[PDB]
Amino acid sequence: VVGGLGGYMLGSAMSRPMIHFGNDWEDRYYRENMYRYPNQVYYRPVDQYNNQNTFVHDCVNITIKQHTVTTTTKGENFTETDVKMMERVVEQMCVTQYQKESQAYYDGRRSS
């Protein structure tokens, strides 16, 4: 019984990028502890938004919202440090989910 998810789907599966955070430790931290974070993101149909940005943001928000709900309360806890890395990983994954969904929904589909 989610409260905040108007039928947001979950993507099929992806891989774990490296995220070049720019701190020497945000990298070393991340590469060690990456096994915690989802290898997936939640989204709505790209076709519903007119623009990538608003949509991919909504994908950051919703993915993390689904975790701070489902994954959390009585499971995991994303500390404030994780929270910042989640936003990094998930945005940089929502742009990938989109490089399928958008272009797949454009190449022989939309026309702008």
From Swiss-Prot:
Its main location: membrane. GO terms for biological process: cellular response to amyloid-beta; cellular response to copper ion; cellular response to xenobiotic stimulus; intracellular copper ion homeostasis; intracellular signal transduction; learning or memory; negative regulation of activated T cell proliferation; negative regulation of amyloid precursor protein catabolic process. N-glycosylated. GO terms for molecular function: amyloid-beta binding; aspartic-type endopeptidase inhibitor activity; ATP-dependent protein binding; copper ion binding; cupric ion binding; cuprous ion binding; glycosaminoglycan binding; identical protein binding. One of its GO terms (cellular component) is membrane raft. Disulfide bonds join C59-C94. It is linked to Found in high quantity in the brain of humans and animals infected with degenerative neurological diseases such as kuru, Creutzfeldt-Jakob disease (CJD), Gerstmann-Straussler syndrome (GSS), scrapie, bovine spongiform encephalopathy (BSE), transmissible mink encephalopathy (TME), etc. This is Major prion protein. It comes from Mus musculus (Mouse). The lineage of its organism: Eukaryota, Metazoa, Chordata, Craniata, Vertebrata. The gene is Prnp.
